[PDB]
Amino acid sequence: GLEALMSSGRVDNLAVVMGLHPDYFTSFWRLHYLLLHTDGPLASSWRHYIAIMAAARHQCSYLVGSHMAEFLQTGGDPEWLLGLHRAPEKLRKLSEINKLLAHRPWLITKEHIQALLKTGEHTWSLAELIQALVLLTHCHSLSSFVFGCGILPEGDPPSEQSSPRDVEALMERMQQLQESEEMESRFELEKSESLPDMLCFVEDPTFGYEDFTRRGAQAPPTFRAQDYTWEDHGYSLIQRLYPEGGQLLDEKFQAAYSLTYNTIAMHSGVDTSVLRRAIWNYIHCVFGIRYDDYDYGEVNQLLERNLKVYIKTVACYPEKTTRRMYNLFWRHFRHSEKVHVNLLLLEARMQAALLYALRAITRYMT
Ligand SMILES: CC(C)C[C@H](N)C(=O)O
Numbered sequence: 001g002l003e004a005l006m007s008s009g010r011v012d013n014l015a016v017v018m019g020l021h022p023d024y025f026t027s028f029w030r031l032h033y034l035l036l037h038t039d040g041p042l043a044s045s046w047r048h049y050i051a052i053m054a055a056a057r058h059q060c061s062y063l064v065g066s067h068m069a070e071f072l073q074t075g076g077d078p079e080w081l082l083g084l085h086r087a088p089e090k091l092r093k094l095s096e097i098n099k100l101l102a103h104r105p106w107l108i109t110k111e112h113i114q115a116l117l118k119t120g121e122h123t124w125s126l127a128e129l130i131q132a133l134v135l136l137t138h139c140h141s142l143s144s145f146v147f148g149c150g151i152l153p154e155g156d157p158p159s160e161q162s163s164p165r166d167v168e169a170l171m172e173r174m175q176q177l178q179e180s181e182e183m184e185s186r187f188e189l190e191k192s193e194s195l196p197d198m199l200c201f202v203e204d205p206t207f208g209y210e211d212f213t214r215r216g217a218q219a220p221p222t223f224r225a226q227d228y229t230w231e232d233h234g235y236s237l238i239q240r241l242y243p244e245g246g247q248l249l250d251e252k253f254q255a256a257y258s259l260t261y262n263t264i265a266m267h268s269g270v271d272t273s274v275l276r277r278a279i280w281n282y283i284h285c286v287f288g289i290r291y292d293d294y295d296y297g298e299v300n301q302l303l304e305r306n307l308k309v310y311i312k313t314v315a316c317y318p319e320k321t322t323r324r325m326y327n328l329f330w331r332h333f334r335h336s337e338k339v340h341v342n343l344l345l346l347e348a349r350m351q352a353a354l355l356y357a358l359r360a361i362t363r364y365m366t
Contacts, residue, residue: 045076054139083200147318220288
């Protein structure tokens with residue numbers, strides 16, 4: 001890790017834990033600095049305020065409190081911090097897609113995009129909108145990280161959970177896979193499986209992944225991954241509308257997806273890409289995205305049940321992560337590998353939310 005930085009006391013708790021993986025940290029930091037400390041379509045105070053709205057969806061006081069202070073240091077009108085109603089109508093129009101991005105991105109529709117781009121006194125342009133979608137999803141994914149790693153307040157360790165053999169069964173089952181129409185059914189099975197001051201910055205506070213207005217667990221509709229991908233569709237849309245941010249996102253997605261030390265717990269010299277692919281593809285499954293050429297049976301073979309409960313809680317209900325839940329899975333793995341799982345999951349989650357929003361923009365433009 002970036003040890004001298006981490007133990008210096010000069011960067012915040014979140015960045016300290018990110019430093020555990022220097023190759024991801026660089027990509028994280030570049031986007032962070034772009035969004036919050038580089039001139040762009042939106043003014044500094046608007047961007048911090050948009051981030052407060054995003055973090056409030058998950059009741060994340062670490063991130064709300066952090067952006068509240070920056071908003072004020074950068075010249076934001078303090079009255080906006082009394083709640084959304086005091087904020088410009090342009091910022092308020094973002095509430096619906098904030099909520100949907102955070103909890104049910106598959107519900108994002110071109111009619112949502114239409115309401116946003118609607119001609120009026122203060123209209124969203126496409127570069128402004130794209131920067132705001134990136135801001136919203138970035139702080140949603142960061143709320144996952146904050147809760148999943150037990151990141152402590154800056155007020156008076158950086159984590160309540162970290163502190164800066166079934167492994168052999170797992171390693172064996174990985175080797176089997178490498179050596180080698182129910183496939184649509186195995187996806188459906190994995191997807192249907194079920195496991196206060198901030199209130200003034202949101203609409204519909206109790207809206208979440210699970211729909212309690214209906215019986216039975218949450219099952220998003222199935223989306224065929226190939227219909228709209230990052231590599232072929234989404235990346236290209238963002239580099240056209242927000243060039244300086246698409247490249248940095250693409251680099252972050254690949255930095256996380258390919259990150260490896262070729263270690264598995266106490267063990268070395270192991271290809272772990274089947275395992276990491278299953279963590280990624282499970283999370284995308286949770287958001288309804290199906291990859292054709294993937295056997296979703298691999299998820300249950302590779303991801304123990306305590307790991308799936310943790311992954312799904314951190315991605316869909318981060319407020320509800322506990323130390324016990326963090327401790328219960330992968331008992332013999334290193335802490336850094338737990339942090340690694342959290343990186344994979346925030347990136348998988350963010351790409352899914354983004355792609356649904358980007359698909360909706362594309363459908364609107366046609
Ligand atoms: C266990 C996995 C999350 C990561 C593993 N430590 C690797 O280097 O690939």
